[PDB]
Write a protein that binds this ligand. Structure first.
Ligand SMILES: CC(=O)N[C@H]1[C@H](O[C@H]2[C@@H](O)[C@@H](CO)O[C@@H](O[C@H]3[C@H](O)[C@@H](O)[C@H](O)O[C@@H]3CO)[C@@H]2O)O[C@H](CO)[C@@H](O)[C@@H]1O[C@@H]1O[C@H](CO)[C@H](O)[C@H](O[C@]2(C(=O)O)C[C@H](O)[C@@H](NC(C)=O)[C@H]([C@H](O)[C@H](O)CO)O2)[C@H]1O
Ligand SMILES: CC(=O)N[C@H]1[C@H](O[C@H]2[C@@H](O)[C@@H](CO)O[C@@H](O[C@H]3[C@H](O)[C@@H](O)[C@H](O)O[C@@H]3CO)[C@@H]2O)O[C@H](CO)[C@@H](O)[C@@H]1O[C@@H]1O[C@H](CO)[C@H](O)[C@H](O[C@]2(C(=O)O)C[C@H](O)[C@@H](NC(C)=O)[C@H]([C@H](O)[C@H](O)CO)O2)[C@H]1O
Ligand SMILES: CC(=O)N[C@H]1[C@H](O[C@H]2[C@@H](O)[C@@H](CO)O[C@@H](O[C@H]3[C@H](O)[C@@H](O)[C@H](O)O[C@@H]3CO)[C@@H]2O)O[C@H](CO)[C@@H](O)[C@@H]1O[C@@H]1O[C@H](CO)[C@H](O)[C@H](O[C@]2(C(=O)O)C[C@H](O)[C@@H](NC(C)=O)[C@H]([C@H](O)[C@H](O)CO)O2)[C@H]1O
Ligand SMILES: *[C@@H]1O[C@H](CO)[C@@H](O[C@@H]2O[C@H](CO)[C@@H](O[C@@H]3O[C@H](CO)[C@@H](O)[C@H](O)[C@@H]3O)[C@H](O)[C@H]2NC(C)=O)[C@H](O)[C@H]1NC(C)=O
Ligand SMILES: *[C@@H]1O[C@H](CO)[C@@H](O[C@@H]2O[C@H](CO)[C@@H](O)[C@H](O)[C@H]2NC(C)=O)[C@H](O)[C@H]1NC(C)=O
Ligand SMILES: *[C@@H]1O[C@H](CO)[C@@H](O[C@@H]2O[C@H](CO)[C@@H](O)[C@H](O)[C@H]2NC(C)=O)[C@H](O)[C@H]1NC(C)=O
Ligand SMILES: *[C@@H]1O[C@H](CO)[C@@H](O[C@@H]2O[C@H](CO)[C@@H](O)[C@H](O)[C@H]2NC(C)=O)[C@H](O)[C@H]1NC(C)=O
Ligand SMILES: *[C@@H]1O[C@H](CO)[C@@H](O[C@@H]2O[C@H](CO)[C@@H](O)[C@H](O)[C@H]2NC(C)=O)[C@H](O)[C@H]1NC(C)=O
Ligand SMILES: *[C@@H]1O[C@H](CO)[C@@H](O[C@@H]2O[C@H](CO)[C@@H](O)[C@H](O)[C@H]2NC(C)=O)[C@H](O)[C@H]1NC(C)=O
Ligand SMILES: *[C@@H]1O[C@H](CO)[C@@H](O[C@@H]2O[C@H](CO)[C@@H](O)[C@H](O)[C@H]2NC(C)=O)[C@H](O)[C@H]1NC(C)=O
Ligand SMILES: *[C@@H]1O[C@H](CO)[C@@H](O[C@@H]2O[C@H](CO)[C@@H](O)[C@H](O)[C@H]2NC(C)=O)[C@H](O)[C@H]1NC(C)=O
Ligand SMILES: *[C@@H]1O[C@H](CO)[C@@H](O[C@@H]2O[C@H](CO)[C@@H](O)[C@H](O)[C@H]2NC(C)=O)[C@H](O)[C@H]1NC(C)=O
Ligand SMILES: *[C@@H]1O[C@H](CO)[C@@H](O)[C@H](O)[C@H]1NC(C)=O
Ligand SMILES: *[C@@H]1O[C@H](CO)[C@@H](O)[C@H](O)[C@H]1NC(C)=O
Ligand SMILES: *[C@@H]1O[C@H](CO)[C@@H](O)[C@H](O)[C@H]1NC(C)=O
Lengths: 170, 341, 341, 169, 341, 169
């Protein structure tokens, strides 16, 4: 979004990322490895699913006929009744449009926020020996190929598997 | 090695509007609308739906029933939802009415607006004490009853002066009492018969135009009869007749009396409609076929999937999608990104 | 040592809905609604509130005042807010009226819809030049004036043909002129007296039903009198009477005249109502007790605390909470978290 | 929230955190110390208070009776008037519901943002010798019991009080 | 060295409201509203705008045209948008009408509500077969026709009884047929002439008040004529006359008949209005000067700049700004900060 | 905002920052240098311009007169029609008021978010030898006067210009 543009996040995207919307890339001698983070993808999906349920919860009064106003006899009143219905339809429509607009605004905006959170998952796993650049990238002392990258995505990656120091967990 | 955070790149044919980024392509959406297709109307799921007023009255129109045409009496079940299937209801029998001279056609459409509809079990006026000399009650072959004897609309009494009473009268006044129960509206049906110069004199002893005036809840209506030269018989029994009746209805709110000022040819109110509650009403057609979540004036019966719908907005009742101007979509993916350099 | 950022954990019985996380428990909320309780109605704070039309008219119903019942004349103060306390207003004296035969009962409810209400100071029609031969003005013991002499409704003149003029007339036409001030609506009160055959001939020289027709702003209404056999006296002075009057009202917009076509027994308009502005009107009951920010048709007077309210939505005026479907809560705390392992 | 779930933030909470909604914990030999941050708590409360004022500022026109339409005579008009009131109430109600939903959306969402900001307060105070883990935690070279944590929350913590280096303020 | 991220500090005279920070000063705003200024009315851009019904009928008022006044027949263009410039339309010729005794004045304002308006080319009632004895059609010098001979309203026929027919009659009934094309409303114009006692008998052979009754779509209206003593001629041709006409209109929906019950002096309907579609109508004034995006009842013609506007809300059609309570502004800058020491 | 308040971000502002809304300051021997970031400023302006287009896209039905309801004859009906118009104006106005409030809420709130992203721009440029304090400030080994700061704002700054190590892109 606007954050990633200013922060110098990569503006392009990775076609290799299929299992999910968000994840990690690894750049080294092997070339470029790509892995999706399912947790980050799932969270985004749950937010959207909740947002879909929320929009679907809206109820409005039925518009039916007036019980008393009779055709021919009360045509003037009926014209006003038609007008009342039309304006109700118009007003609720624009309100729903606003609710959906704000929903889509949130979903698209939350992308960089996901990336920022994926930094924190990546950072902790990599241990204190890795170097944070700031553009969403870390420089590692160890090599990290597709097999390595995949363990990161799964959250099972250990830095001791390259004799590197770790943040010992709780 | 350098490890980065990245976002996927895929085909992004779908478009959504945002507040701060305008329209953007995305990898996936959840559609929030559909355009429904026109279908037959149906019963509203979880609610008995009224079509014909009296379902067991075969070969009877709603107006037939509302007027109390002989052979067309029966149970009128309550309903919280009603379909208006005749914008201008018609009769299909009994004595020839000149419908367009009053508001009478809309009477069954008025009734169906109520949840509960019943015909009164006693008469609202005793014809044997009604003003305007002694009467005998007239009938017609146009209105054969359940044993095919000559009858008349059960809501009215075609009162005729006795042979010693064939004489003109000044306009006399009768008060129509409120005979319904707590909370019920009373709908009083009444009118007047007229004929050519000869029959008028035979029946009433007067061939001059007669005058009628009703008054209820601030509403007054005035009529003057026509002597012969009537328009052709229509929507009646098909049996040729030289006379015509004019029919009207009178709404009496709870505890309210009405008055009718009449001369010769008066059709005095007998049985009256007692109605209460409200039925939700929309335009539609018969028969009702199956069930549906939503009855929609334009699409008929439709079941609810998406929360919203696009197309022709109109009156609709039940569990319905909400109308919107445009096919809205909820984003289910990421804003499009080009493949990495 | 490890230092972290953390969030508290507390009992979280309260629930709020979110867009992206559904319903969540929280440690604290700020309630945005209350369900009001029924209270007596009151004066609207910062606005003089009308109850009775004429506060100084003791033993007078609003309809009494509107008709100009003797002893029931007085100042009618302006008000931007009015309580409708009679859905079907009644009289409590003077000559027996057959109320339900016209729209007359609602006359004071029509008047209270205006901010300003005054009775005209001159008569709108001079009875000594009014069509239909020479007249004398009639009075009754049913309508004792301020010195307990025989009087009549000050809005009307019970005009009677003189002894040399006791004869039937063809329907004559009078123009009711517009006599109110700039911007004011004129509300013209009029009617007709009727009796049994004997009194009719004695008073008017005609015992036939008389006919009356008014016309104003496109609205025509037609009446036919009744000769004897009247409904029983009610809402009147309690003195036995053989006759009944029918009363109606006629709205004349600024600078607009109306017409009345009448025969014998006519109650000609005299003093007329002159009204202007609009008063905000809701259903309520009397007396008004104290002050309130808001008058609510269902809950009466209530003061404003929470921004919204739940319960029975109805018409309401003043500084009111806004009705909502559900008891909304503003989150004032943190989403529930289990105690840390 | 969704950030904290992905970021590996602690999903549980601290019953000991009473003076406020947000704050710090210290895990060491002393066991686990817990302190609330009043600055972060006040900010959250003020945001909500302003949000309450905003919701309370909405005004809508009174619904009263029609001045001209008379009972019995104009019952058909009055029915439509009743319908107008019903639909106004319905529409404004749903609009207010939307406004409150978004308000609650903001308040609940802002939690992780508060945590993220407490990181920046904690980090500067702890000095350059501490190690940022990324999960909202810092590992210190020095011990920090409840007395130490209280100094952090109060903003008085100095790293020179453990002969450790500071970012010069 | 220490490098930090910072935000500017500038003059911040503008204020906007926020959800969570209240009102805050900002360095710049984008105004979203303006208060419009009152302007002359105009043509609606992209839509032909109707003013006078018949623009080329010079020295003819809208009411003149609607009544079918001679010389005031002409091209009446269709229009999807119409200006109501007469709240109470007046005539400027032909025989003296007592306008205020019916709803007739609003007739051209009713017509302009339709997109298409045409006068029928055949008569709806044959005067040579109309009930009430044989007739001749009357004319007047007050209504000079296209060759300047004595004429009358093209919508009506001033029928006069022939010399063998100078006699009073009982109320006779004529049925008014529906003669318009598919979808069209028929607006039927009719009325009755009256005069002083002498002229009534010369013309009609009866000097008693005459009675007239119309009936259409459930609506009955009743009139009783006046004999002499009329109000003064106004809004007419200016030629002195002893008689007055009362004019009324009767709306007939597709396929609906109406009836008129009449005696002597009847103005039988001839040419009738056939109208269809809907014109969008707002109050305005003439002449229309130039073009505009929006026609606004209060501001006249105005062009659209800002998306919203403040000021007097009223009916408006076209490409219009949306009314708002307050001059809203979108923030275009940063929240105010004091200069950093 | 509330983030910057808790995070201990500088609450004041810089009058010297003219070319833009957001940017950097440099504190050293030179005194205090100030430069605006055009990229961050442009982004903020674009979001607002898009937000303006969105608000301007709303269409609502015109309110005109009833075709059938005639003055005098149908004044009761006309009163209800006036009420219908009045409530439409009232309801839509409050909806727009809500839409605009949320727009400005987003715009004002996003200020700290811009700063947080400017940290990431600054951090990468400064190279691995710089020290992140946490309050939005970095400590450098090299001097950075106004000429240096301008290079940072422009994104042209290299750490090799002081022979210091860089994150190589
Ligand atoms: C009323 C009658 O007898 N009608 C019968 C019809 O009669 C014709 C001819 O006799 C003839 C007379 O010259 O012309 C018609 O009238 C002419 C005439 O020039 C003048 O009288 C008049 O001024 O101008 C007219 C111009 O047209 C006259 O109407 O002849 C037919 C064929 O022979 C015959 O079928 C008619 O008899 C009626 O028919 C119907 C069914 O077609 C019914 O059987 C009628 O019985 C009823 C009915 O059920 O409707 C019997 C009811 O008991 C009775 N009800 C009451 C309260 O009296 C009704 C009632 O009389 C009429 O319905 C009222 O119009 O009649 C049967 O009478
Ligand atoms: C007119 C009269 O004398 N009425 C008094 C009443 O008279 C009785 C007897 O005449 C009786 C015997 O014939 O007949 C009763 O009516 C008969 C009638 O013959 C039939 O038509 C009818 O169908 O059947 C009836 C019998 O079954 C008739 O009513 O007797 C009572 C008993 O004392 C007496 O009260 C009546 O006198 C009127 O009383 C009231 C008080 O109750 C008033 O004082 C009346 O004075 C007024 C009034 O103030 O209202 C005097 C007014 O000046 C006068 N107003 C005008 C404008 O003239 C009115 C006016 O006459 C009446 O209101 C007209 O109804 O009367 C007092 O007259
Ligand atoms: C018919 C006639 O003579 N009209 C003229 C009228 O004459 C005077 C005198 O006769 C006078 C003598 O006593 O009586 C006046 O009426 C008295 C009446 O006697 C009393 O009972 C009553 O209480 O008071 C009345 C007023 O005091 C009577 O009015 O008036 C003048 C006298 O010269 C004259 O203008 C009248 O002639 C009419 O004038 C107009 C123009 O002003 C037209 O030319 C009329 O021609 C027409 C017309 O075109 O309008 C001719 C038409 O052919 C005819 N239309 C039809 C369908 O027949 C109309 C029609 O008569 C009018 O509408 C009638 O009101 O007249 C011309 O008649
Ligand atoms: C404009 O008005 C003139 C006169 O007002 C109309 O012309 C006239 O029409 C009448 C009746 O048609 C003629 O009067 C006579 O009619 C009887 C009918 O039996 C006839 O027998 C007589 O011989 C006589 O014609 C009258 O002569 C005639 N012309 C004039 C100059 O009066 C004219 O029709 C009107 N214009 C239009 C377009 O209708
Ligand atoms: C973004 O979406 C738009 C609209 O869905 C795409 O534009 C369409 O592309 C198809 C090709 O498959 C054409 O047939 C249509 O005519 C285009 N319509 C419009 C309105 O542009 C566009 O290609 C998408 N962009 C990306 C990058 O996926
Ligand atoms: C249906 O048929 C006839 C109508 O003519 C009714 O039976 C007649 O009623 C009259 C009443 O005056 C009596 O003379 C006899 O009972 C019958 N006479 C003839 C000639 O049939 C019958 O009551 C009507 N109604 C029903 C059956 O409910
Ligand atoms: C929205 O999310 C995805 C769109 O990519 C939809 O498809 C699901 O994606 C998840 C990946 O986490 C997998 O279970 C499958 O690929 C899909 N599941 C199913 C059942 O199709 C997902 O269905 C969408 N959600 C909604 C509510 O529409
Ligand atoms: C979250 O709030 C709900 C609603 O108050 C709690 O559920 C209620 O629990 C009480 C006591 O256990 C019962 O009396 C109610 O009947 C429950 N209501 C419903 C709708 O279930 C729930 O316990 C709370 N959860 C937590 C973790 O605090
Ligand atoms: C109330 O009582 C009577 C009406 O019945 C009025 O008395 C009349 O007063 C005038 C004064 O000029 C006398 O000429 C009449 O002779 C009186 N009539 C009778 C029958 O006594 C009295 O004025 C009325 N007072 C009002 C209306 O204020
Ligand atoms: C929102 O809830 C908080 C609770 O966390 C309230 O804050 C308390 O208010 C009391 C009295 O005003 C004071 O002691 C402190 O401000 C808070 N107490 C504690 C123990 O934290 C706050 O008042 C609530 N806000 C509103 C508007 O009701
Ligand atoms: C922020 O708020 C308002 C902006 O309207 C400023 O107050 C107004 O400033 C004008 C200009 O001199 C003076 O009339 C008064 O000081 C205020 N007038 C009104 C009507 O409020 C305020 O000074 C602004 N503050 C800053 C720091 O820019
Ligand atoms: C919002 O404000 C900005 C500036 O604060 C406007 O952009 C500047 O406009 C001036 C002249 O109007 C130019 O000289 C600058 O080059 C513009 N860009 C800057 C200063 O970065 C912008 O036009 C405003 N937005 C709208 C929609 O009017
Ligand atoms: C914490 O640190 C200091 C060391 O003197 C002091 O406050 C206290 O003795 C220590 N222990 C506890 C439990 O506070
Ligand atoms: C109308 O004429 C009558 C007498 O014929 C008179 O009373 C009245 O003042 C006149 N008014 C006008 C407006 O000419
Ligand atoms: C800062 O930069 C260079 C030296 O590195 C030189 O221009 C001068 O010393 C300084 N100039 C300014 C404007 O501070």
């Amino acid at each position: 979004g606007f954050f990633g543009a200013i922060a110098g996040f990569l503006e392009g995207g990775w076609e290799g990322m299929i299992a999910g919307w968000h994840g990690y890339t690894s750049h080294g001698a092997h070339g470029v490895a790509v892995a999706a983070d399912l947790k980050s993808t799932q969270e985004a999906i749950n937010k959207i699913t909740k947002n879909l349920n929320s929009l679907s919860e809206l109820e409005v009064k039925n518009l039916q006929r007036l019980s008393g106003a009779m055709n021919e006899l009360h045509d003037e009143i009926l014209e006003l009744d038609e007008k009342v219905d039309d304006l109700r339809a118009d007003t609720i429509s624009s309100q729903i449009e606003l609710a959906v607009l704000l929903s889509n605004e949130g979903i698209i905006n939350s992308e960089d926020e996901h990336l920022l959170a994926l930094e924190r998952k990546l950072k902790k796993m990599l241990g204190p020996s890795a170097v944070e650049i700031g553009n969403g990238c870390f420089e590692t002392k160890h090599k990290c190929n597709q097999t390595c990258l995949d363990r990161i995505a799964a959250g099972t990656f250990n830095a001791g598997d390259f004799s590197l120091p770790t943040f010992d967990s709780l | 090695d350098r490890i980065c955070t990245g976002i996927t790149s895929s085909n992004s044919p779908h478009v959504v509007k945002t507040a701060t980024q305008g329209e953007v392509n995305v990898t996936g959406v959840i559609p929030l609308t559909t355009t429904p297709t026109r279908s037959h109307f149906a019963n509203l799921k979880g609610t008995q739906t009224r079509g014909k007023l009296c379902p067991n009255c075969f070969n009877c129109t709603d107006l037939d029933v509302a007027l109390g045409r002989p052979k067309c009496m029966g149970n009128i079940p309550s309903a919280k939802v009603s379909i208006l299937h005749e914008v201008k209801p018609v009769t299909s029998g009994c004595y020839p009415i000149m419908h367009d001279r009053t508001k009478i056609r809309q009477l069954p459409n008025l009734l169906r607006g109520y949840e509960n509809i019943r015909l009164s079990t006693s008469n609202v006026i005793n014809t044997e004490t009604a003003p305007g000399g002694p009467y005998k009650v007239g009938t017609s072959g146009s209105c054969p009853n359940v044993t095919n004897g000559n009858g008349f609309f059960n809501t009215m009494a075609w009162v005729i002066p006795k042979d010693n009473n064939k004489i003109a009268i000044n306009p006399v006044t009768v008060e129509v009492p409120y005979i319904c129960s707590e909370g019920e509206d009373q709908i009083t049906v009444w009118g007047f018969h007229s004929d050519d110069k000869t029959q008028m004199e035979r029946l009433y002893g007067d061939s001059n135009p007669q005058k009628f005036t009703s008054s209820a809840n601030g509403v007054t209506t005035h009529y003057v009869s026509q002597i012969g030269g009537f328009p052709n018989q229509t929507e009646d029994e098909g049996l040729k007749q030289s006379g015509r009746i004019v029919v009207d209805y009178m709404v009496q709110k709870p505890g309210k009396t009405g008055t009718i000022v009449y001369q010769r040819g008066i059709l005095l109110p007998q049985k009256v409609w007692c109605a209460s509650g409200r039925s939700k009403v929309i335009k539609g057609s018969l028969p009702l076929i199956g069930e549906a979540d939503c009855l929609h004036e334009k699409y008929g019966g439709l079941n609810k999937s998406k929360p919203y719908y696009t197309g022709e907005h109109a009156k609709a009742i039940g569990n319905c999608p909400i109308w919107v101007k445009t096919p809205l979509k909820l984003a289910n993916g990421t804003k499009y990104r080009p493949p990495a350099k």
